[PDB]
Write a protein that binds this ligand. Structure first.
Ligand SMILES: Nc1ncnc2c1ncn2[C@@H]1O[C@@H]2COP(=O)(O)O[C@@H]3[C@H](O)[C@@H](COP(=O)(O)O[C@H]2[C@H]1O)O[C@H]3n1cnc2c(N)ncnc21
Ligand SMILES: Nc1ncnc2c1ncn2[C@@H]1O[C@@H]2COP(=O)(O)O[C@@H]3[C@H](O)[C@@H](COP(=O)(O)O[C@H]2[C@H]1O)O[C@H]3n1cnc2c(N)ncnc21
Ligand SMILES: Nc1ncnc2c1ncn2[C@@H]1O[C@@H]2COP(=O)(O)O[C@@H]3[C@H](O)[C@@H](COP(=O)(O)O[C@H]2[C@H]1O)O[C@H]3n1cnc2c(N)ncnc21
Ligand SMILES: Nc1ncnc2c1ncn2[C@@H]1O[C@@H]2COP(=O)(O)O[C@@H]3[C@H](O)[C@@H](COP(=O)(O)O[C@H]2[C@H]1O)O[C@H]3n1cnc2c(N)ncnc21
Ligand SMILES: [Zn+2]
Ligand SMILES: [Zn+2]
Ligand SMILES: [Zn+2]
Ligand SMILES: [Zn+2]
Lengths: 370, 374, 374, 370
DNA sequence: TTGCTCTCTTAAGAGAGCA
DNA sequence: TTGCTCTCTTAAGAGAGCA
């Protein structure tokens, strides 16, 4: 009268795919000694007797015996803990975690196949804080779009700056990581992924480095860009958001050096460009409200790309000398920027960045080009 | 076409579980009957099919029975999809579906293992004063973490900022604060785990003077899996309301002139201008406020994120106007002070001078902290 | 001296468990009575004492009751040691023992958590031929791993070396072998875990031609937590005898001359010299053997380690004699071929030319692999 | 008649310190929600009925009901698995793991306090294989000698060589890791460890780098050297082994450059020294049977140190020009070698190493000195 | 040759009486 | 004011009869 029947336990195992709803462990197999076994327990949130953990007098136990909204698949340890600390694992909290777990499974089961890609994380250590993109979050963002991979992918972390800051040694190391380490790790995959597998790539690293990354993978391989967002991590903030307008101001005439100022994350003060590059003729690409949060979805990235491609060809047509780049842009845009410099734009680009060893002044770092 | 693949009931249960009970080609939930109060006829609402052929036609180019012996190579399909799969007379597909099937299984597994992505470090940071009058026990953070899917696996970190000596909150004092936090944080983020070896998430709450909270933000940054929690006078560590929409952050630009630039943040309460100009003579005041300032305004974490997004938009505008330092007079909740410090951790740095209210001098605004190019 | 500290029975149980039932000052096992068939008088054979004083004399300079409230700050002592601890009238020590007590607890915890240091990756590597005639199922490695404290947490890796095409086992072939192993190995060693975030141990067994086994050794190296397992014709993956002492590795130096230098390893069987000189005309033979060559000689893992130690001592002597390549003719078990390849992974590299017996050409010795400066 | 009594369950919890004998998890506390709870199970290896897992007709269940040799403390998941796969978890294997677990606890409980130290792991990536010293194994070797720490310590991993091999950039990076990263991480500890805490240090890294490490920590701090061993990992192979004899051959007279050849791990061929340093006058320190396995215990390291200190002063007395070092030595000896070069020996030492980019020839790398 | 039921097994926390 | 016993609770795998 109180016992959950076999059909329902089957349903509970099915709808959870046989993992513990609270810790995620696989409950269909013992990896230690190698035997398939169903070592999980079907657990009641609200108990039969009102004197059990989370018990209530107003709970019709008979009416809810085979109510899968009351039943979780738990490993025996999780189940033992939740029944020993009802105040710490209350009904509202368990039911909410239960429902959310089930919905993530249902959405994965209804996502159509969208192909395969190599996950690629590239991150620096030039910040004074930890900088770490979780692998699970990239793979989960891939999976929400139907994309899967044969392994957890490549994760490259640049060496930190040494005692002299971002000196020539540092930039040599950045280069070696992008142009040697990355390539050696793509080759070690062999044919696992094929001839030209796609790269599902997310960066959070020096702006010059990310532009170099972009240039290196631009034609080399097909690319699916993802983005780290302060609020939403690897999830796109809002798939329905419309891209902003990319405003452009052309440079003035003259012989002075040509500068391309990109004010997307923030407004780059012109005083800081003329300090670093006296006599500069400034061209500027910006959005109406510069913001760190603006990479709302992948169409924002493409629209940036489409807008900048147009203007780069224009700017190259003006001078034979390098274009000097001063950029306050999100990391995903930095990668797309470099991917445009592959062959479409074979002019020399000298990339300035903020220099903590020179009181936040812009200084020259990397040169991108033919 | 033609044949059907024989399975026993143990194999059915295993296939139904690894696929979560949906057709691998169209995604229909095959537990519909049970949800409708009808008995599950498990063998009638689904077909089980090996994912790979035996070989050319139905001619084993390999040990086909040794591959289908693995339940991992068996698919679940609704009958309509099964009927569109041409097969030989033993039930094996004529064409290979192994790629699509293994991709389906990976997507279910990544969803089923998502709870282990909650592995977390608890971190409570208080000033000696709030530790005495308003101690936050680790238990209170853990149950708030747990309700959100965050799971600690070792003791939590609870730090109390030492009070200052005679030198005051000087540069050495703030550097030892930062080192103390990053030391504990780094040792616990070496404790990787889960399915992919990811570093644990950080679950952090603070209650201290606003400049110390900003230094906690400086220490943790905003480029890692981190979740701020918030102490609330009425709801303690539980969010007052997960459905509340963030307020509008109103902004009043500074008047024009050469006086020092002040950023007044009137979020907890309305800061009077005379208190600002007493401490900073000639100040030119810019103000970020909300329509109804309130100590209780942190209804959920989206409010913290929305404050940071509006704050950063206005900081860009202000820094455009002048290279000189920005003098910060903040009436904000503790969670917003943390996120303010964390925002200011990019390579780019502008000078910010943080004014605290001196509880031992009439609550007078007092400069205790400088962030930025030094 | 004087006072005693009151504890209830729940607190006693907690202190007895966190200390494993020994005195924290002298280490005596306080469960002696139970081991002797006598009833445990838990409150008589031990004293429980806070580790830290209340303050000067027995004068709380702090909330002493708030600290002893934590059972983690309570010590277990035998009565004789307790009697040597001068105390105040509430039972608190007069002098601070917190450091010694917390160090004791850490040592017990590091021992109690030692099972999680067994986290492991299973790896089975075979040639297509041995996979067909002598497949090693993952289950057999797992139960041998488990019996030794090694615990896998995901599916094991089982690799089969592709057979060579018309180009033979050329440089490209051996590089793809190495890449294939290091690819799988690296992805699974990213899966850190346990108490400290350590990478998992590797548990590896191989059955393939000796040159391929040496390349597996080249791929895994010998500078990480790795445990070789061994297939044995009679004991399968279980060690025949954990108490067996390794045999003596006998060595016969090469005669003097200018002929090519050959290293003959007669461990599984005695290699006839004419087989060596057929393949390598003019060879100058050095030989490492054991007294009674036998296919069954890998009784335990110490035998593998002892072979490597004797082998390396003799390789140093041989390489001293000539800069020219060393030509290797090995009759050794599979586990010894793996460890031989792993030995040769330092920065220093001498040229080694490995001869295999061609099963499709009368078992003729044939050079298939070159290791070293290329 | 069959039930384990409360005294014995108490004994089982006590002697295991309340952790799962098979997975090591803490069974006295729920870290997720914060409540102390005893969530483990006292488990029988041989069961009551002979029809249970590992059952046997010849097992007197009544005689062994409170036999702690038959009872393990297990988490509920481990206990559920071992009872579902008796063939995979047989009596002999469980009993052996049980006994070993208990003995590790007893030895930790009887180890006297031996002070505190900062664990320090330093490892390179210049090998073509993974190179990774487990933290647990250093902390366990420390604990066997009574030493404990407040944290798991410092673990530095040098950047890998880039595409040019061990070039000037590589060696700059090694320097920065030893002289900047290490120091910044010792300072971040603050007063946690005191003014001059000791370093419990183990290296596995380039010989030149380890000598630089040694020179940097030699006087800076008190040092407890540990060693990675191919067979025994961080455990000392044999605490009763006697040190070998360190044989010395003095250099010949002449004006040629002075070389110090160290043949400890292996015999360094003289042909390789005269190739790199024509006209070299070779002095040699060696043991009678060079071997990778020779670091049997810490007295072997001290005896090497004592023998080399004597000879370095002699060699410095011979020339005013640098001493050129060609060394095939274990990693722990490389660290002790450098620690002697702090002030006792203020002559210039030029360190040669094997060069994979020059066909295994010795080439000059780092210069150690005043 | 399941594939629903009711008994059985194994662990544990109360509850009573007593210590 | 434990601090040994026997009942109670919750999960599960057989075992029987039948489907
Ligand atoms: N006057 C000016 N005002 C403001 N910024 C200015 C400037 N002049 C230059 N800049 C630079 O523009 C970049 C804006 O920051 P961003 O976040 O929009 O983009 C960054 C960038 O693409 C890359 C490297 O960061 P950094 O080197 O600090 O460069 C900063 C900053 O110095 O990683 C992105 N990034 C950093 N931290 C992140 C996080 N937590 N989450 C997500 N993406 C993050
Ligand atoms: N004109 C002005 N009028 C009103 N305030 C003004 C001001 N000009 C500046 N301020 C400052 O704005 C902060 C508002 O108070 P708050 O409560 O919203 O946020 C505080 C703050 O973030 C941090 C340190 O407190 P304090 O130094 O008093 O800072 C005050 C106050 O000095 O901890 C938070 N905090 C304190 N006690 C808390 C509790 N019990 N529960 C939860 N959070 C608590
Ligand atoms: N004059 C000479 N006389 C005898 N052998 C001679 C020789 N000159 C060279 N040799 C080689 O010495 C190896 C001895 O055999 P082994 O069994 O001790 O070790 C083998 C080897 O390590 C690897 C590949 O086998 P193979 O290529 O035949 O190598 C043979 C043989 O060619 O796998 C191991 N292996 C094979 N089958 C196994 C099994 N069933 N169980 C367990 N381990 C097994
Ligand atoms: N003619 C010659 N013959 C043999 N060696 C010669 C030589 N001329 C130079 N040498 C060098 O002497 C060192 C001997 O090896 P070693 O192991 O005794 O000591 C090493 C060393 O101290 C440091 C860097 O290693 P590496 O740069 O390869 O230097 C090698 C080798 O190139 O790490 C130690 N190390 C490496 N791997 C280890 C492991 N798995 N376990 C434990 N410690 C390990
Ligand atoms: Zn669980
Ligand atoms: Zn379908
Ligand atoms: Zn004692
Ligand atoms: Zn366990």
């Amino acid at each position: 009268r109180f016992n959950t029947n076999d059909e329902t336990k089957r349903i509970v195992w099915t709808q959870t795919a046989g993992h513990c709803e609270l810790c995620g462990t696989d409950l269909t197999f013992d990896y230690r000694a190698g035997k398939p076994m169903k070592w999980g327990e079907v657990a009641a949130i609200l108990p039969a007797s009102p004197k059990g953990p989370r018990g209530r007098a107003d709970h019709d136990a008979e009416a809810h015996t085979n109510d899968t909204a009351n039943l979780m698949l738990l490993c025996p340890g999780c189940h033992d803990k939740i029944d020993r600390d009802a105040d710490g694992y209350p009904e509202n909290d368990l039911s909410g975690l239960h429902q959310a777990y089930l919905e993530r499974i249902r959405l994965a089961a209804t996502t159509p196949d969208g192909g395969r890609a190599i996950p690629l994380i590239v991150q620096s250590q030039h910040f004074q804080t930890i900088n770490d993109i979780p692998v699970r979050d990239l793979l989960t963002a891939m999976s929400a779009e139907g994309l899967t991979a044969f392994d957890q992918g490549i994760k490259i972390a640049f060496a930190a700056p040494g005692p002299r800051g971002r000196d020539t040694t540092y930039w040599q190391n950045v280069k070696d990581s992008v142009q040697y380490e990355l390539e050696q790790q793509l080759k070690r995959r062999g044919g696992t992924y094929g001839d030209s597998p796609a790269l599902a790539v997310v960066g959070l690293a020096d702006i010059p480095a990310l532009m170099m990354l972009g240039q290196s993978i631009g034609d080399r391989s097909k690319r699916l860009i993802f983005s780290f967002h302060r609020e939403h991590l690897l999830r796109w903030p809002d798939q329905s958001a419309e891209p902003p307008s990319f405003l452009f101001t052309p440079p003035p005439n003259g012989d002075g050096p040509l500068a391309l100022v990109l004010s997307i994350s923030a407004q780059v003060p012109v005083r800081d460009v003329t300090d670093a590059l006296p006599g500069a003729r400034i061209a500027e690409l910006s959005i109406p409200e510069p913001s760190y949060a603006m990479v709302q979805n992948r169409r924002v990235i493409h629209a940036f790309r489409d807008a900048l491609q147009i203007r780069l060809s224009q700017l190259e047509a003006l001078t034979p000398d390098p274009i000097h780049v001063f950029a306050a842009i999100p990391a995903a845009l930095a990668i797309e920027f470099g991917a445009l410099l592959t062959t479409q734009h074979q002019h020399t680009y000298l990339i300035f960045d903020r220099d903590k060893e020179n009181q936040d002044r812009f200084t020259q770092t990397l040169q991108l080009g033919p």
